[PDB]
């Protein structure tokens, strides 16, 4: 015996009025209801075994993952409003700097530094896109997966920036291998080998907890501090005034990925056992990350 409620039964028993974010984001993975079969299939179908092993048996544990909250509380609607304003701003920058013939005025040889150190970033960013999608599909709460979904889209955004600018730059500098030689560099250039070794290994860490820690607490902070910021400094010394503005827009996204990441860690550490699990994965990956940074930086500031 009961009566209509103003919101979902799961949101009903809290004082506050449910927000847009609460209504459309919370507790949507039914695949976490039955520990013995995630999916409504044979309890040992292949995907059920996969989830039991790489989600349910993660040593990263919490009894209410669903209580996690995006500190930005983004939903699809507000992500697109925000990103249409930032991306419309970056495209207007592209258009105006092109009108001003920005690219011809960079310092002698800077096109070669771009072709070696910038344009092959499309491989790296695509790896971050693939990896974000993996954490999406494995995470044990829809509020966590939703942050990953947006992160996956931001990674494609950065990839797409890089593709557009590689092509555009080649129009002023058609003899630097721009848009022609990136796959080779990624595969064979020593400065790309630490990163590639890092990402190939990271993309085969299939535990949802280890995937999240290695991607969001080790790999992506290293890219901010060892790839984005030094590329801004190098552009400054070579009269590339577009690239620092572009990377500032990308850093906005990165800082958002870092914000939800730390909030998830804060949620995880309500369980005291989780602090040694997170830290050991950080110690495990940090050396691959550091090697990857050093090899890149040596390339970047080499002759």
């Amino acid at each position: 015996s009961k009566k209509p409620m103003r919101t979902w039964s799961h949101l009903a028993e809290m004082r506050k009025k449910p927000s847009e974010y609460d209504i459309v984001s919370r507790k949507l993975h039914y695949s976490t209801n039955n520990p013995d079969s995630p999916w409504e299939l044979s309890p040992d179908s292949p995907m059920n075994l996969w989830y039991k092993q790489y989600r349910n048996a993660s040593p990263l544990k919490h009894d209410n993952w669903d209580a996690f909250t995006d500190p930005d509380q983004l939903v699809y609607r507000t992500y697109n409003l925000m990103q249409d304003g930032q991306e419309s701003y970056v495209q207007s920058l592209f258009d105006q700097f092109n009108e001003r013939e920005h690219d011809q005025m960079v310092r002698e040889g800077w096109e070669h530094t771009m072709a070696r150190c910038y344009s092959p970033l499309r491989y790296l960013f695509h790896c971050l896109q693939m990896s974000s999608a993996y954490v999406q599909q494995m995470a044990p709460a829809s509020t966590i997966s939703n942050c990953c979904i947006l992160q996956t889209a931001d990674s494609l955004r950065w990839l797409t920036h890089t593709a557009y600018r590689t092509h555009e730059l080649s129009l002023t500098y058609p003899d630097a291998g721009l848009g022609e030689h990136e796959r080779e560099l990624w595969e064979k250039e020593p400065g790309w080998q630490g990163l590639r070794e890092l990402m190939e290994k990271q993309l085969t860490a299939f535990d949802w907890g280890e995937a999240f820690v290695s991607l969001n607490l080790v790999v992506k902070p290293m890219i901010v501090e060892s790839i984005f910021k030094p590329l801004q400094q190098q552009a400054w010394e070579n009269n590339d005034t577009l690239l620092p503005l572009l990377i500032d827009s990308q850093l906005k996204d990165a800082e958002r990925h870092s914000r939800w990441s730390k909030a998830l860690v804060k949620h995880a550490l309500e369980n005291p056992d989780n602090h040694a699990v997170i830290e050991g994965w950080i110690e495990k990956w940090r050396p691959l990350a550091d090697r990857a940074a050093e090899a890149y930086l040596s390339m970047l500031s080499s002759d």
Binding site: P46, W50, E87, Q129, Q137, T160, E197
Partner: protein, 491 residues
């Protein structure tokens, strides 16, 4: 100046590389990727024919949602809820319940491809695909939320997929099979090609026509907007199929398409068939369910399948016959067992409707009409106990729906059974049994709700214990005759 997309598009999908520090198979394992041994280099010729790119996407999706929400806001006071035929309100309840959290599940089929497809263009389109299904999941929680305060069965927009209610279990068995439970290439073929270019048009456009006739533009506007995303991300499947066919895998491709079409069919027959031919008010039936099947599935989808180089499925004649017959019996089942549903089925058998049914389906009155005659008399003579069941229907081991047949003057019903691994399974068609036999490890230890009932997992082991089992918490949540039987006054 800006450079047009065709000049830089190829770089956005130049993202395949030769792995060195792990092997290709470690990076794309077959159980998650489904590449069937086709090497990396062959996937690079994958060409998504319906392209988009990140700046265009956020800009145009922003404009799609602005219109959807603005229309909903401008119409909140048009009293749809209060003035609509209760059969229409039940249509809204079953739709949002069966679909909202299934959309959000589809994010994971798209994420499966975004990570594990060896085709770079697929991995990018899957990334917009993820975004799209998020959109659809959030829209279809947001839109019914309004209504929670009117009617607890609108809570099932959120609750259904967390329940063991039998129709929620049929939804989850199906979506977990074709969306979340298989490798990336299986998703491409079973979800984006078979389901998303074929069947969802029935529910998001066929039903929109009916919604428009019913004067419910919030809903027609919403679901047709949703289908414009579908039209784009569903085009991930054709180029995978074409690649499979070119590399020697036509037979495996065909079998996946055959399976997914039939699984989708038996689920639409129980959800959309009753909606279209019974719940939707007579005067709002734009076309019969069968007419919509012939438009969307036979006329549009089967012809597309033919054009890509595949064959009609082997069961095509079973299928045609089924379109004539199956949903009439599923509707009867859902309505006689209405108390196990979270919407309120309309009987849809006033004389005027029965005339329409007879026109759309010659011979209906001498078939299903024979049963409805018994039901209708019981109602007139106020024998309401003969109008509620005291037992469980026998449930399918594939699609999780009751086993049915043609009643009345030429009674025909068949169960296709199978002994396997020390157990007895029952299927409601030749095709359902065949699907099971294509991949027994996927299904063999699944237990449908009647299985559970007979093994002790439902306590008490009574129809009421099963009702509680299915998640129902008050008499108001369980389904009732939509018009509370006032249709019998017209009989």
């Amino acid at each position: 100046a800006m450079h047009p997309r065709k000049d830089w598009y190829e770089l956005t999908r130049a993202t395949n590389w030769t792995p060195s520090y792990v092997t290709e198979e470690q990076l794309f394992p077959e159980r998650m990727s489904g590449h069937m041994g086709i090497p990396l280099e062959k996937w690079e010729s994958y060409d998504e024919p319906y392209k988009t790119s990140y700046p265009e996407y956020v800009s145009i999706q922003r404009e799609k949602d602005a219109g959807a929400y603005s229309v909903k806001a401008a119409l909140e006071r048009a009293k749809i809820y209060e003035n609509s035929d209760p059969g229409w309100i039940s249509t809204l309840k079953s739709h949002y319940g069966a679909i909202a959290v299934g959309e959000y599940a589809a994010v994971t089929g798209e994420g499966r491809m975004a990570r594990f497809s060896k085709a770079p263009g697929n991995r990018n389109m899957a990334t917009f695909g993820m975004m799209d299904e998020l959109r659809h999941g959030q829209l279809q929680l947001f839109f019914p939320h309004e209504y929670c305060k009117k009617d607890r069965q609108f809570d099932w927009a959120w609750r259904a997929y967390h329940s063991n209610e039998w129709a929620a279990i049929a939804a989850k068995h199906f979506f977990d099979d074709i969306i979340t439970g298989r490798d990336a290439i299986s998703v491409a073929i079973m979800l984006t090609f078979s389901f998303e270019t074929g069947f969802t048009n029935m529910q998001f456009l066929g039903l929109a026509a009916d919604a428009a006739e019913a004067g419910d533009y919030t809903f027609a506007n919403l679901i047709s907007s949703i289908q414009t995303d579908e039209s784009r991300h569903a085009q991930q499947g054709g180029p995978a199929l074409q690649l499979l066919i070119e590399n020697g895998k036509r037979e495996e491709a065909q079998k996946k398409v055959d399976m997914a079409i039939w699984r989708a069919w038996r689920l639409f027959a129980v959800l959309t068939g009753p909606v279209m031919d019974y719940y939707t008010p007579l005067e709002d039936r734009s076309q019969s369910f069968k007419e919509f099947m012939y438009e969307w599935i036979i006329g549009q989808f089967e012809r597309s399948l033919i054009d890509l180089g595949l064959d009609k499925p082997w069961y095509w004649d079973l299928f045609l016959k089924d379109i004539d017959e199956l949903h009439h019996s599923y509707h009867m089942g859902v309505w006689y067992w209405r108390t196990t549903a979270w919407w309120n089925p309309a009987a849809g058998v006033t004389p005027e409707e029965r005339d329409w049914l007879e026109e759309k389906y010659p011979g209906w009155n001498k078939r299903w009409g024979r049963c409805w005659d018994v039901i209708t008399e019981n109602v007139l003579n106020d024998r309401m106990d003969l109008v509620s069941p005291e037992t469980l229907p026998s449930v399918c081991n594939m699609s999780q729906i009751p086993l049915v047949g043609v009643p009345g003057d030429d009674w025909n019903i068949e169960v296709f059974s199978l002994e396997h691994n020390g157990r007895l399974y029952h299927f409601g068609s030749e095709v359902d049994r065949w699907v099971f036999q294509q991949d027994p490890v996927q299904y063999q230890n699944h237990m449908n709700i009647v299985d559970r009932f007979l093994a002790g997992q439902i306590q008490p082991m009574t129809l009421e214990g099963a009702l509680k089992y299915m998640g129902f918490q008050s008499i108001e949540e369980m389904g009732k005759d939509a018009h509370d039987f006032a249709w019998a006054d017209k009989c």
